[PDB]
Structure formats: structure tokens, C-alpha cells
What does this fold into?
Amino acid sequence: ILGGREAEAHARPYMASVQLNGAHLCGGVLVAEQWVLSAAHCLEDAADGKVQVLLGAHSLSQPEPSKRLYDVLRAVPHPDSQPDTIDHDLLLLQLSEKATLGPAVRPLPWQRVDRDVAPGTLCDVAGWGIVNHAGRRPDSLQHVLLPVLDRATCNRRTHHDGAITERLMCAESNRRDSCKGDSGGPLVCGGVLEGVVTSGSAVCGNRKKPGIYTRVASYAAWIDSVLA
It folds into this structure.
């Protein structure tokens, strides 16, 4: 997270660290007691390759009562996701067992009605992604507040050139943006999960390139069917 701030420890009890071989790979959001939502590309490339999810965490390395590592029973990427596209870039992970809920671990309500988030709404995105252009990554969770950018403006050639579908959304990324390792992370509006960070970035904070987030409401049907 670029242009952010260390978050209050465990103030976002839904926050997940999706992990590969003991290292933070991606953000994630606990959406049901045994299900975490993330990005499909976090996993694409394959793995062979131990995937796990850290819940109740603030610091990735330091001891905390609420920290708990879960093995993953099944990785369900969205079947229409492709390793070379930003489209349908969602991944569901069933935990080895239902999560132990508490002040530091709680599922987050997500959006099921397929309407756009009003442009100008301030939404909260958190993660352990790189914090500067030199590529340094935080030990503890960062967050930032970003205004939602209208899709029309986000589709201008200078920005993303018509690529932002009705299934995607944009947030302003002028000095403040989500970066590499923030993928799969949650974009949260008024206490409700609206976005999942897609593939970005490392080219983090270019205002001419807004942050792209997959709209969860667009994949409500899919999420439910996997969860049943």
C-alpha cells in the first residue's frame, strides 16, 4: 500500500494473508466462516506449492494471540479467469476448518445487488503490499482511503483505454494506491466489501493509471454457488 499508514491492529478482523510456502503472497477477505476471497492470479502460475491463509494477523512475523494459520482444502479460481487477463480474477479458498471467530477474526458482509458504487465514495483498502517504489514491504498491515473513480473517466485512453468492464471498478491512485502483494486484498465501502484488488502493481501510484478492483456484486451468483 502506497501513501498509506499502519492500520489499527486487528481493527479489520476480516483481513486475510494468503500465503505460499510460509510467505505472504496476497491479500484476501474472510467472507464466510470457512471461506476467504482473493484474486485468481495470486495462484495462477501454479503452485506445488503449499498454500495457506493467516487470519487474526497484524504483523506477519511477530507473535500475536489471535494469529492462526489455516491449510487450504480447495482453491476455486473463477473458471473464466485467464493468466493473461484482468477479467474474472477471483479465487475462493476453503479453509481446512471453520475459522475461530473473535474480535480479531470476523467475516465481512459483501455486496450481492449488482449496482455500481457511487463515484466519489471513499473506500478502505488494506494490505501488506509494497509501500514504496524501492519495493520495501511492511511487517504490519497498512490501509488507505481512496475515492471511487467513475468508470467512464477510468476508461479514457490516457488511463485504461476501455478495459474497465461493468464487472470492474476503479479507485483514484494519485500517490495513494494498492501495489504488488496487495492483490486479492479487499476494497471496502461503508463496512461492505465491494472490491477485490486485481493485478497491480509495482507501477504503484501513477495517477494516470487508477487502481482496478473486481466488483464482487458482479460475481454474487458464482460466490454463492461455490459456497453452497
In short: The radius of gyration is 16 Å.
